[PDB]
Amino acid sequence: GMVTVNEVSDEARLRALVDRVTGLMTELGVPGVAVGILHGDREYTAGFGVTSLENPLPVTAGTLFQVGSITKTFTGTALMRLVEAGRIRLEDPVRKYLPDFRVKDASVSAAVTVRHLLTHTGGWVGDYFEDFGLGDDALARMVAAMADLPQITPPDTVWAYNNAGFYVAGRIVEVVTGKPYESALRELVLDPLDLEHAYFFAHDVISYRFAVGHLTGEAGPFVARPWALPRCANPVGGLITSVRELFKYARFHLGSGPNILSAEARRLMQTPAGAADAGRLMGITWFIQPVDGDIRLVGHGGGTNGQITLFNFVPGRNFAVCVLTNSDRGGAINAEVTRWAVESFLGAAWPEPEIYSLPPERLATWAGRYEGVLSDIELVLEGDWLVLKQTPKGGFPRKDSPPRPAPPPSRLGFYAPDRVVALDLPLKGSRGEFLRGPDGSIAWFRFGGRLFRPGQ
Amino acid sequence: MVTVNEVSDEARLRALVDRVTGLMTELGVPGVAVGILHGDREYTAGFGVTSLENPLPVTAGTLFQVGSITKTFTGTALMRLVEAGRIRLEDPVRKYLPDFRVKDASVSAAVTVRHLLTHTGGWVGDYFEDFGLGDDALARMVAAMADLPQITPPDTVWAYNNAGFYVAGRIVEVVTGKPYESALRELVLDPLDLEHAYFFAHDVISYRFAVGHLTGEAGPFVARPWALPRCANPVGGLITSVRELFKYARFHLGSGPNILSAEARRLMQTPAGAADAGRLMGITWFIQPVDGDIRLVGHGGGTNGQITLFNFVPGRNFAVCVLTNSDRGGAINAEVTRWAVESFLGAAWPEPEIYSLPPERLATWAGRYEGVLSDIELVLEGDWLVLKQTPKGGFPRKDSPPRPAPPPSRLGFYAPDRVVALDLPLKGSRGEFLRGPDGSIAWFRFGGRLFRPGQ
């Protein structure tokens, strides 16, 4: 059962895209993929596949997807909204607005600022997902539950993707505004930017065209259940929107949109506040990726229960690209579509780092167990290559949800000292870094933004 | 030309599929789902599409908003707490809700649980607002009922009372110590093995569901908002399919597991008095006599563009199910139910005989009639009285816009002070003029709701 090509705005221009994507989906098993490209006054949209495997409908440019972690930028934009009005400062401590907030470390609980949450420099355990109902008290109970959150590293030491840090970021918006986050996000960002179809609950998306998530196991893909994230995770990644609205979001952040943030504040979100992971830079919620001289990708990735998305934009060039898939393997599509649009519309040259292996005597020093909070990473020496074998521990989306189907193993190839990238689909493209301790021993293995402790 | 999706028995339902395929193109309903249970044989029939913007074939497993049918589920939970010796229908409400209050002080102290389940409260029945998506939504609504005025004193004039089930549902919450949606699972839903019986959009979204359709001037369109307030879940927030309503039907026929005693279900199906339009009122059940010993026991359902109907005949292992996703599906709810009764049991449907009234006599019933959710105008046209409904809004939410008014319908008499509409989509709805002791018209009961004569 091959994939469908539902809608293509320009057929001749996106012809290479149509064939490049229509191929991958057959490979990975992605049920549906929505693409949107922006270049000056022109907008290029393309829809592939079906919304659901059980309930198929053609994926279009207006199809509603769960953009996932892209919502963090909306939370940051809403916070910078409050910074411009003189109500919040990024250097202010969190306890200035939530005096009851606390994590396991008391010294960190009193020194963490708003800037720490938006730059993932808190240091506590990030991937922490519980459910506290569907009422407006869900987010306030999430933050109070963070009192047991242990410290992985002290703050401002080793960069770590922090989902839990945005519970506080959204809760700060709740307190300073005095309204629920979903209403406040709608008040400061959605309504002024004319984001018509941008929702947080399933009771607003049912009557339209939406996508469901898919997990792929041995015998193929299947619908991912449950479809909805906990309400307390909405400031983290609970937004549901389409390509046509992500275009409006891109125009604003490119300086070509309305002024809910002055240009000065918008460029501050896109100024590197420090290093992130895998050669990326950390803005204010924004990820910055150097490419070709002045050309650098600003954006963020997304991923819920079976819905993997990506959003990027080039400042001063009026360029943007959105890719929204409904499979746990759509990240491979997210990368190739983003790369082609930059190489096709901006004519840039991409930094393809040289892939190499090492003598197996050295590779044996990297193999072993690597323990995370959401999954395990398993490196074993097979042939002249190191192979990554991931194993989800369970706990997503709910604390009782089952372990998701593990992806097929992939070979690891070095492109720099202590830096690797996966060479086989569907993990192909994900970079990793071995952070070593003061004695020279492996202290962490950062992969996908998360830190894994060497167990051996 | 409407696609036929599923038929369990094409031969036995040969005449059925033809009647529905024609009735859908006439009224404009996008999809219906039919389920017939007779003995050990079950007959299902899938029809049409789940949506006009996003069609999908409707099957027996397609999730429909059964609407006010949920009231029967709420009464089943309370009747389960009846058997456990936890609650009593004759007990006042304040025994379980000591803070409960309506505008009338005496009624607040005398209303019982039986009053809630039999629509005999007397306060304003149609009262809807929103208090969030949390487990506190039902508590804030019952507390907001402290201002609901009295239309009539209790046990005087029967009237449909949605509000009473806010309290009847809240009584389940306090007695069990769980949310109302959870308490229903623990009491009836899970004991009867009905997985696909949900209340929230976030649980139905991953499956096949039907969206509501409203019929306006430019034709039918997808009804927004799809969602009902969480506090209205004890009123009519249940979402399920035909496959699950069979087990629910089988249970009340006795051919299911006994979470309720046999005499309890019989006491639920026993008429506790007269309701509206010749129907009888049991414990949440609506009883309509048709022929001899055969009686239709069931309930209607109505949400934002989804009309449903569920009836069963005790003593015959018989039950019918018709779920439509458009506001004009009521004629198909009656037609399929009417056909199924005398096709599988062989009875004779009570088709009322109509007689005409001179215009000098009809003019005594004409005038303006004011209601809560809609307005009624009775107009003399030729040798007939014409009903004109004018909704004012407030459904599903207190700020929702008024729905398109249904086409007017002529009114024909079948008994003194008793009418029945003759034109679609109102064809079949009977009305009643209740006369005060002084002989003047006190109320016009239409659609189970009361209307005051205009001043």
Short mmCIF file of all heavy atoms in Angstrom, two decimals, chain A residues 52 54-57 133-136 201-210 212 223-228 231 398, chain B residues 51 53-56 132-136 140 200-202 204-209 211 222-224 226-227 230 397:
data_model
loop_
_atom_site.label_atom_id
_atom_site.label_comp_id
_atom_site.label_asym_id
_atom_site.label_seq_id
_atom_site.Cartn_x
_atom_site.Cartn_y
_atom_site.Cartn_z
N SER A 52 -4.41 9.02 9.72
CA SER A 52 -4.40 7.89 10.63
C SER A 52 -4.38 6.60 9.81
O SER A 52 -4.89 6.55 8.69
CB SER A 52 -5.63 7.90 11.55
OG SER A 52 -5.99 6.59 11.94
N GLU A 54 -5.75 3.67 10.95
CA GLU A 54 -7.07 3.08 11.09
C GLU A 54 -8.15 3.94 10.44
O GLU A 54 -9.10 3.42 9.85
CB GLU A 54 -7.41 2.85 12.57
CG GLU A 54 -6.50 1.87 13.28
CD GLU A 54 -6.62 1.96 14.79
OE1 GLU A 54 -7.46 2.75 15.27
OE2 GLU A 54 -5.87 1.24 15.49
N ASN A 55 -8.00 5.27 10.52
CA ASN A 55 -9.00 6.22 10.03
C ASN A 55 -8.31 7.14 9.03
O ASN A 55 -8.01 8.31 9.34
CB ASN A 55 -9.62 7.00 11.18
CG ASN A 55 -10.23 6.10 12.24
OD1 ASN A 55 -11.41 5.76 12.18
ND2 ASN A 55 -9.41 5.69 13.21
N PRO A 56 -8.06 6.67 7.81
CA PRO A 56 -7.23 7.44 6.87
C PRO A 56 -7.97 8.62 6.25
O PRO A 56 -9.15 8.53 5.89
CB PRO A 56 -6.86 6.41 5.80
CG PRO A 56 -7.99 5.43 5.82
CD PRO A 56 -8.50 5.38 7.24
N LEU A 57 -7.26 9.74 6.14
CA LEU A 57 -7.71 10.96 5.50
C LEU A 57 -6.48 11.63 4.92
O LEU A 57 -5.42 11.61 5.56
CB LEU A 57 -8.42 11.91 6.47
CG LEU A 57 -9.83 11.53 6.90
CD1 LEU A 57 -10.36 12.56 7.88
CD2 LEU A 57 -10.75 11.42 5.69
N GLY A 133 -4.82 15.55 36.35
CA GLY A 133 -6.16 15.88 35.93
C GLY A 133 -6.19 16.78 34.71
O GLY A 133 -5.19 17.01 34.02
N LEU A 134 -7.39 17.30 34.44
CA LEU A 134 -7.62 18.20 33.32
C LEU A 134 -8.07 19.58 33.76
O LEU A 134 -8.50 20.38 32.92
CB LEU A 134 -8.65 17.60 32.36
CG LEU A 134 -8.55 16.09 32.14
CD1 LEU A 134 -9.78 15.58 31.41
CD2 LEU A 134 -7.29 15.74 31.37
N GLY A 135 -8.00 19.89 35.06
CA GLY A 135 -8.38 21.20 35.54
C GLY A 135 -7.23 22.20 35.48
O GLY A 135 -6.08 21.85 35.21
N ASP A 136 -7.57 23.46 35.74
CA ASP A 136 -6.56 24.52 35.72
C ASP A 136 -5.51 24.33 36.81
O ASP A 136 -4.45 24.96 36.74
CB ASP A 136 -7.24 25.88 35.87
CG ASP A 136 -8.49 26.01 35.02
OD1 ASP A 136 -9.36 25.12 35.12
OD2 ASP A 136 -8.60 26.99 34.26
N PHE A 201 -6.39 21.29 23.45
CA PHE A 201 -7.23 20.19 23.91
C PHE A 201 -7.87 19.50 22.72
O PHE A 201 -8.08 20.10 21.66
CB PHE A 201 -8.32 20.68 24.87
CG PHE A 201 -7.84 21.70 25.87
CD1 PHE A 201 -8.06 23.05 25.67
CD2 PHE A 201 -7.16 21.29 27.01
CE1 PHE A 201 -7.62 23.98 26.59
CE2 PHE A 201 -6.72 22.22 27.93
CZ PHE A 201 -6.95 23.57 27.72
N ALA A 202 -8.20 18.22 22.91
CA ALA A 202 -8.82 17.44 21.84
C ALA A 202 -10.24 17.90 21.53
O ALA A 202 -10.73 17.64 20.43
CB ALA A 202 -8.83 15.96 22.22
N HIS A 203 -10.90 18.58 22.47
CA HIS A 203 -12.26 19.04 22.25
C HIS A 203 -12.35 20.25 21.33
O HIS A 203 -13.45 20.77 21.12
CB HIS A 203 -12.94 19.33 23.59
CG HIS A 203 -12.38 20.51 24.32
ND1 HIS A 203 -12.60 21.81 23.93
CD2 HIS A 203 -11.62 20.58 25.44
CE1 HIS A 203 -11.99 22.63 24.76
NE2 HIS A 203 -11.39 21.91 25.69
N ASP A 204 -11.22 20.71 20.79
CA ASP A 204 -11.20 21.78 19.81
C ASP A 204 -10.71 21.32 18.44
O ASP A 204 -10.88 22.06 17.46
CB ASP A 204 -10.31 22.93 20.30
CG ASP A 204 -10.88 23.63 21.52
OD1 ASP A 204 -12.12 23.81 21.58
OD2 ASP A 204 -10.10 24.00 22.41
N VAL A 205 -10.12 20.13 18.34
CA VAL A 205 -9.53 19.65 17.09
C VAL A 205 -10.33 18.52 16.46
O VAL A 205 -10.04 18.16 15.30
CB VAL A 205 -8.07 19.21 17.29
CG1 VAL A 205 -7.25 20.34 17.87
CG2 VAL A 205 -8.00 18.02 18.20
N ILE A 206 -11.30 17.94 17.17
CA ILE A 206 -12.01 16.77 16.65
C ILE A 206 -12.76 17.12 15.38
O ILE A 206 -12.73 16.37 14.39
CB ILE A 206 -12.94 16.19 17.73
CG1 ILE A 206 -12.21 15.16 18.58
CG2 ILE A 206 -14.18 15.56 17.10
CD1 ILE A 206 -13.06 14.54 19.66
N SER A 207 -13.46 18.26 15.37
CA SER A 207 -14.32 18.62 14.25
C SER A 207 -13.56 19.01 13.00
O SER A 207 -14.19 19.25 11.96
CB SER A 207 -15.25 19.76 14.67
OG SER A 207 -14.51 20.93 14.97
N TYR A 208 -12.23 19.07 13.04
CA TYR A 208 -11.41 19.43 11.89
C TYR A 208 -10.61 18.22 11.43
O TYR A 208 -10.82 17.09 11.87
CB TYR A 208 -10.50 20.61 12.23
CG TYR A 208 -11.21 21.83 12.75
CD1 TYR A 208 -11.37 22.05 14.11
CD2 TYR A 208 -11.72 22.78 11.88
CE1 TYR A 208 -12.01 23.17 14.59
CE2 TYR A 208 -12.37 23.91 12.34
CZ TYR A 208 -12.51 24.10 13.70
OH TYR A 208 -13.15 25.22 14.17
N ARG A 209 -9.66 18.47 10.52
CA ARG A 209 -8.74 17.45 10.06
C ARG A 209 -7.49 17.48 10.93
O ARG A 209 -6.79 18.49 11.00
CB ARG A 209 -8.37 17.67 8.59
CG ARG A 209 -7.94 16.40 7.87
CD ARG A 209 -7.48 16.70 6.46
NE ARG A 209 -7.99 15.72 5.51
CZ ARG A 209 -9.21 15.74 5.00
NH1 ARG A 209 -10.08 16.67 5.33
NH2 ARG A 209 -9.56 14.80 4.13
N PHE A 210 -7.22 16.36 11.60
CA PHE A 210 -6.10 16.26 12.53
C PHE A 210 -5.36 14.95 12.26
O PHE A 210 -5.85 14.07 11.56
CB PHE A 210 -6.57 16.32 13.98
CG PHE A 210 -7.43 15.16 14.37
CD1 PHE A 210 -6.88 14.05 15.00
CD2 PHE A 210 -8.79 15.16 14.09
CE1 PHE A 210 -7.67 12.97 15.34
CE2 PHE A 210 -9.58 14.09 14.44
CZ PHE A 210 -9.02 12.99 15.07
N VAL A 212 -3.14 11.61 14.00
CA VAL A 212 -2.86 10.79 15.17
C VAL A 212 -1.43 10.28 15.07
O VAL A 212 -0.84 10.21 13.98
CB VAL A 212 -3.86 9.62 15.31
CG1 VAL A 212 -5.28 10.10 15.06
CG2 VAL A 212 -3.49 8.50 14.36
N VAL A 223 -1.33 2.81 15.41
CA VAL A 223 -1.75 4.05 16.06
C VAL A 223 -1.22 4.10 17.49
O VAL A 223 -1.26 3.11 18.23
CB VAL A 223 -3.28 4.17 16.03
CG1 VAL A 223 -3.71 5.57 16.44
CG2 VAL A 223 -3.80 3.85 14.64
N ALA A 224 -0.73 5.27 17.89
CA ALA A 224 -0.16 5.47 19.21
C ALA A 224 -1.25 5.95 20.17
O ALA A 224 -1.90 6.96 19.92
CB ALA A 224 0.99 6.48 19.16
N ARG A 225 -1.43 5.21 21.27
CA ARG A 225 -2.40 5.56 22.29
C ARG A 225 -1.73 5.60 23.65
O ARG A 225 -0.90 4.73 23.96
CB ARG A 225 -3.57 4.57 22.30
CG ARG A 225 -4.69 4.93 21.33
CD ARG A 225 -5.31 3.69 20.71
NE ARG A 225 -6.27 4.03 19.68
CZ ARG A 225 -6.33 3.45 18.49
NH1 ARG A 225 -5.49 2.48 18.14
NH2 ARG A 225 -7.25 3.85 17.61
N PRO A 226 -2.06 6.58 24.51
CA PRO A 226 -3.07 7.61 24.25
C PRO A 226 -2.59 8.72 23.32
O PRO A 226 -1.39 8.92 23.16
CB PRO A 226 -3.35 8.17 25.65
CG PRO A 226 -2.07 8.01 26.37
CD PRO A 226 -1.43 6.75 25.82
N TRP A 227 -3.54 9.43 22.70
CA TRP A 227 -3.20 10.48 21.76
C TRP A 227 -2.90 11.80 22.45
O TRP A 227 -2.11 12.60 21.94
CB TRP A 227 -4.34 10.65 20.75
CG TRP A 227 -4.20 11.84 19.84
CD1 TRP A 227 -3.69 11.85 18.58
CD2 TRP A 227 -4.60 13.19 20.13
NE1 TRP A 227 -3.74 13.12 18.06
CE2 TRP A 227 -4.29 13.96 18.99
CE3 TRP A 227 -5.18 13.82 21.23
CZ2 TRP A 227 -4.54 15.33 18.93
CZ3 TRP A 227 -5.43 15.17 21.17
CH2 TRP A 227 -5.12 15.91 20.02
N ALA A 228 -3.51 12.04 23.61
CA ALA A 228 -3.40 13.33 24.28
C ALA A 228 -2.31 13.30 25.34
O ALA A 228 -2.17 12.32 26.08
CB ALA A 228 -4.73 13.73 24.91
N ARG A 231 -2.37 17.49 30.70
CA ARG A 231 -2.64 18.92 30.60
C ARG A 231 -1.48 19.74 31.15
O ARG A 231 -1.20 20.84 30.65
CB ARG A 231 -3.93 19.27 31.33
CG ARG A 231 -4.23 20.77 31.35
CD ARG A 231 -5.46 21.09 32.16
NE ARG A 231 -5.71 22.53 32.20
CZ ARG A 231 -6.91 23.09 32.15
NH1 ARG A 231 -8.01 22.36 32.04
NH2 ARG A 231 -7.01 24.41 32.20
N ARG A 398 2.25 8.72 29.86
CA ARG A 398 1.85 8.66 31.26
C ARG A 398 2.80 7.78 32.05
O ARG A 398 3.50 6.92 31.49
CB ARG A 398 0.41 8.14 31.39
CG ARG A 398 -0.59 8.81 30.47
CD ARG A 398 -1.17 10.07 31.09
NE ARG A 398 -2.55 10.29 30.68
CZ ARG A 398 -3.14 11.48 30.69
NH1 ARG A 398 -2.50 12.57 31.04
NH2 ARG A 398 -4.42 11.56 30.32
N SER B 51 -18.56 12.46 8.82
CA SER B 51 -18.48 13.91 8.78
C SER B 51 -18.64 14.38 7.35
O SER B 51 -18.44 13.62 6.40
CB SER B 51 -17.15 14.41 9.37
OG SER B 51 -17.02 15.82 9.23
N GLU B 53 -17.01 17.43 6.40
CA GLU B 53 -15.68 17.92 6.10
C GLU B 53 -14.65 16.80 6.07
O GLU B 53 -13.69 16.87 5.29
CB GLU B 53 -15.26 18.98 7.12
CG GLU B 53 -15.99 20.31 6.99
CD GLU B 53 -15.64 21.27 8.11
OE1 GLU B 53 -14.69 20.98 8.87
OE2 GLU B 53 -16.30 22.32 8.23
N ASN B 54 -14.84 15.77 6.89
CA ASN B 54 -13.91 14.64 6.97
C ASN B 54 -14.67 13.31 6.97
O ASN B 54 -14.73 12.61 7.99
CB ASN B 54 -13.04 14.75 8.23
CG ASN B 54 -12.38 16.11 8.36
OD1 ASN B 54 -11.22 16.28 8.01
ND2 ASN B 54 -13.13 17.08 8.88
N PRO B 55 -15.28 12.93 5.83
CA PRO B 55 -16.02 11.67 5.78
C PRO B 55 -15.15 10.47 6.13
O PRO B 55 -13.95 10.43 5.87
CB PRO B 55 -16.47 11.59 4.32
CG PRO B 55 -16.44 12.96 3.80
CD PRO B 55 -15.71 13.85 4.77
N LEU B 56 -15.80 9.46 6.73
CA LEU B 56 -15.27 8.14 6.99
C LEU B 56 -16.47 7.22 7.10
O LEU B 56 -17.50 7.64 7.64
CB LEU B 56 -14.43 8.09 8.27
CG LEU B 56 -12.91 8.20 8.10
CD1 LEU B 56 -12.26 8.73 9.36
CD2 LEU B 56 -12.32 6.85 7.71
N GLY B 132 -14.98 24.77 33.62
CA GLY B 132 -13.69 24.16 33.37
C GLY B 132 -13.79 22.69 32.99
O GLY B 132 -14.86 22.10 32.86
N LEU B 133 -12.61 22.10 32.80
CA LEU B 133 -12.48 20.69 32.46
C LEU B 133 -12.04 19.83 33.64
O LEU B 133 -11.68 18.67 33.44
CB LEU B 133 -11.50 20.51 31.30
CG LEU B 133 -11.84 21.13 29.94
CD1 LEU B 133 -13.34 21.08 29.67
CD2 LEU B 133 -11.31 22.55 29.83
N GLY B 134 -12.06 20.38 34.85
CA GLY B 134 -11.57 19.66 36.01
C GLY B 134 -12.65 18.84 36.69
O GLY B 134 -13.83 18.90 36.36
N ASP B 135 -12.21 18.05 37.67
CA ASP B 135 -13.11 17.23 38.46
C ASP B 135 -14.02 18.05 39.36
O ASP B 135 -14.94 17.50 39.98
CB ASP B 135 -12.30 16.23 39.29
CG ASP B 135 -11.44 15.33 38.44
OD1 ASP B 135 -10.78 15.84 37.51
OD2 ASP B 135 -11.43 14.11 38.67
N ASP B 136 -13.77 19.36 39.46
CA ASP B 136 -14.57 20.27 40.26
C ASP B 136 -15.73 20.88 39.49
O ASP B 136 -16.51 21.64 40.07
CB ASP B 136 -13.69 21.40 40.80
CG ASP B 136 -13.10 22.25 39.70
OD1 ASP B 136 -12.85 21.72 38.60
OD2 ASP B 136 -12.88 23.46 39.93
N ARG B 140 -19.14 22.88 41.21
CA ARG B 140 -19.45 24.30 41.04
C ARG B 140 -20.80 24.51 40.37
O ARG B 140 -21.43 25.55 40.58
CB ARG B 140 -18.34 24.98 40.23
CG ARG B 140 -16.97 24.91 40.87
CD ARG B 140 -16.04 25.96 40.28
NE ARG B 140 -15.03 25.37 39.41
CZ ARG B 140 -14.40 26.03 38.45
NH1 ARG B 140 -14.65 27.31 38.20
NH2 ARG B 140 -13.50 25.39 37.71
N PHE B 200 -14.73 12.08 27.17
CA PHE B 200 -13.86 13.18 26.79
C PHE B 200 -13.43 13.04 25.33
O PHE B 200 -13.41 11.95 24.77
CB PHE B 200 -12.62 13.22 27.68
CG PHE B 200 -12.92 13.16 29.14
CD1 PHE B 200 -12.47 12.10 29.91
CD2 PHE B 200 -13.67 14.16 29.75
CE1 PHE B 200 -12.75 12.04 31.26
CE2 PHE B 200 -13.95 14.11 31.10
CZ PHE B 200 -13.49 13.05 31.86
N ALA B 201 -13.09 14.18 24.74
CA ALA B 201 -12.59 14.19 23.38
C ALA B 201 -11.21 13.54 23.28
O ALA B 201 -10.87 12.97 22.24
CB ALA B 201 -12.53 15.62 22.85
N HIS B 202 -10.42 13.60 24.35
CA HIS B 202 -9.06 13.08 24.31
C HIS B 202 -9.00 11.56 24.38
O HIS B 202 -7.92 10.99 24.20
CB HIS B 202 -8.22 13.69 25.44
CG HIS B 202 -8.73 13.39 26.82
ND1 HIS B 202 -8.59 12.15 27.41
CD2 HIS B 202 -9.36 14.17 27.73
CE1 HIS B 202 -9.12 12.19 28.62
NE2 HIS B 202 -9.59 13.40 28.84
N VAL B 204 -11.76 9.72 22.72
CA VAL B 204 -12.44 9.35 21.48
C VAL B 204 -11.60 9.70 20.25
O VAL B 204 -11.79 9.09 19.19
CB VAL B 204 -13.82 10.03 21.42
CG1 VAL B 204 -14.59 9.63 20.18
CG2 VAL B 204 -14.62 9.70 22.67
N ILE B 205 -10.66 10.63 20.39
CA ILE B 205 -9.97 11.21 19.24
C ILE B 205 -9.20 10.17 18.44
O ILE B 205 -9.02 10.32 17.23
CB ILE B 205 -9.05 12.35 19.71
CG1 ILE B 205 -8.65 13.24 18.54
CG2 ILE B 205 -7.83 11.80 20.43
CD1 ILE B 205 -8.69 14.69 18.85
N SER B 206 -8.74 9.10 19.09
CA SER B 206 -7.92 8.10 18.41
C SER B 206 -8.75 7.06 17.67
O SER B 206 -8.17 6.26 16.92
CB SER B 206 -7.00 7.40 19.41
OG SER B 206 -7.60 7.34 20.70
N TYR B 207 -10.06 7.05 17.84
CA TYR B 207 -10.94 6.05 17.25
C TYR B 207 -11.81 6.69 16.18
O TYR B 207 -11.63 7.85 15.80
CB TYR B 207 -11.78 5.38 18.34
CG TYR B 207 -10.95 4.70 19.41
CD1 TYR B 207 -10.92 5.18 20.71
CD2 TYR B 207 -10.19 3.58 19.11
CE1 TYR B 207 -10.17 4.56 21.69
CE2 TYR B 207 -9.43 2.95 20.08
CZ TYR B 207 -9.42 3.44 21.36
OH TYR B 207 -8.67 2.82 22.33
N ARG B 208 -12.78 5.92 15.68
CA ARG B 208 -13.73 6.41 14.69
C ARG B 208 -14.91 7.04 15.41
O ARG B 208 -15.56 6.40 16.25
CB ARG B 208 -14.21 5.27 13.79
CG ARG B 208 -15.23 5.70 12.75
CD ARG B 208 -15.18 4.80 11.53
NE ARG B 208 -13.83 4.66 11.01
CZ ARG B 208 -13.52 4.11 9.85
NH1 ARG B 208 -14.46 3.62 9.05
NH2 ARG B 208 -12.25 4.03 9.48
N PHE B 209 -15.19 8.30 15.09
CA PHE B 209 -16.25 9.06 15.75
C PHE B 209 -17.04 9.83 14.71
O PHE B 209 -16.57 10.06 13.59
CB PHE B 209 -15.67 10.02 16.79
CG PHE B 209 -14.53 10.85 16.28
CD1 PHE B 209 -14.77 12.03 15.60
CD2 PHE B 209 -13.22 10.45 16.48
CE1 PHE B 209 -13.72 12.79 15.12
CE2 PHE B 209 -12.17 11.20 16.00
CZ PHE B 209 -12.42 12.38 15.32
N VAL B 211 -19.04 13.45 13.97
CA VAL B 211 -19.23 14.84 14.36
C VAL B 211 -20.67 15.23 14.09
O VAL B 211 -21.34 14.64 13.24
CB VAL B 211 -18.23 15.77 13.64
CG1 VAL B 211 -16.84 15.15 13.60
CG2 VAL B 211 -18.72 16.08 12.23
N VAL B 222 -20.94 21.13 9.50
CA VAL B 222 -20.37 20.53 10.70
C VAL B 222 -20.66 21.43 11.90
O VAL B 222 -20.44 22.64 11.85
CB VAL B 222 -18.86 20.30 10.53
CG1 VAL B 222 -18.21 19.99 11.86
CG2 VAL B 222 -18.61 19.17 9.53
N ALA B 223 -21.17 20.83 12.97
CA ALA B 223 -21.60 21.57 14.15
C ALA B 223 -20.43 21.83 15.08
O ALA B 223 -19.73 20.90 15.49
CB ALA B 223 -22.70 20.81 14.89
N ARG B 224 -20.22 23.10 15.42
CA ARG B 224 -19.22 23.52 16.38
C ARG B 224 -19.87 24.34 17.49
O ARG B 224 -20.74 25.17 17.21
CB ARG B 224 -18.11 24.35 15.71
CG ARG B 224 -17.66 23.80 14.36
CD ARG B 224 -16.14 23.77 14.26
NE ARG B 224 -15.68 22.73 13.34
CZ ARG B 224 -15.58 22.89 12.03
NH1 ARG B 224 -15.91 24.03 11.44
NH2 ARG B 224 -15.15 21.87 11.28
N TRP B 226 -17.95 20.84 19.02
CA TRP B 226 -18.25 19.42 19.16
C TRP B 226 -18.42 19.02 20.61
O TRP B 226 -19.18 18.09 20.91
CB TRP B 226 -17.13 18.60 18.51
CG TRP B 226 -17.33 17.11 18.57
CD1 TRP B 226 -17.84 16.31 17.59
CD2 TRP B 226 -16.99 16.23 19.66
NE1 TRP B 226 -17.86 15.00 18.00
CE2 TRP B 226 -17.35 14.92 19.26
CE3 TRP B 226 -16.44 16.43 20.93
CZ2 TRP B 226 -17.16 13.82 20.09
CZ3 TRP B 226 -16.26 15.33 21.75
CH2 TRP B 226 -16.62 14.04 21.33
N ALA B 227 -17.74 19.70 21.53
CA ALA B 227 -17.68 19.29 22.92
C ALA B 227 -18.86 19.84 23.71
O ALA B 227 -19.37 20.93 23.44
CB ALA B 227 -16.38 19.75 23.56
N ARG B 230 -18.13 19.62 30.80
CA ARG B 230 -17.89 18.44 31.62
C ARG B 230 -18.96 18.28 32.69
O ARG B 230 -19.33 17.15 33.03
CB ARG B 230 -16.50 18.49 32.26
CG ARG B 230 -16.11 17.19 32.95
CD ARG B 230 -14.81 17.31 33.73
NE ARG B 230 -14.59 16.14 34.57
CZ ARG B 230 -13.41 15.76 35.03
NH1 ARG B 230 -12.30 16.43 34.76
NH2 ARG B 230 -13.33 14.67 35.80
N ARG B 397 -23.34 26.00 25.02
CA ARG B 397 -22.82 26.87 26.06
C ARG B 397 -23.65 28.14 26.15
O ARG B 397 -24.27 28.57 25.17
CB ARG B 397 -21.34 27.20 25.81
CG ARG B 397 -20.51 25.97 25.48
CD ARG B 397 -19.03 26.30 25.37
NE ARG B 397 -18.32 25.28 24.60
CZ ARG B 397 -17.02 25.03 24.72
NH1 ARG B 397 -16.26 25.70 25.57
NH2 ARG B 397 -16.48 24.07 23.97
#
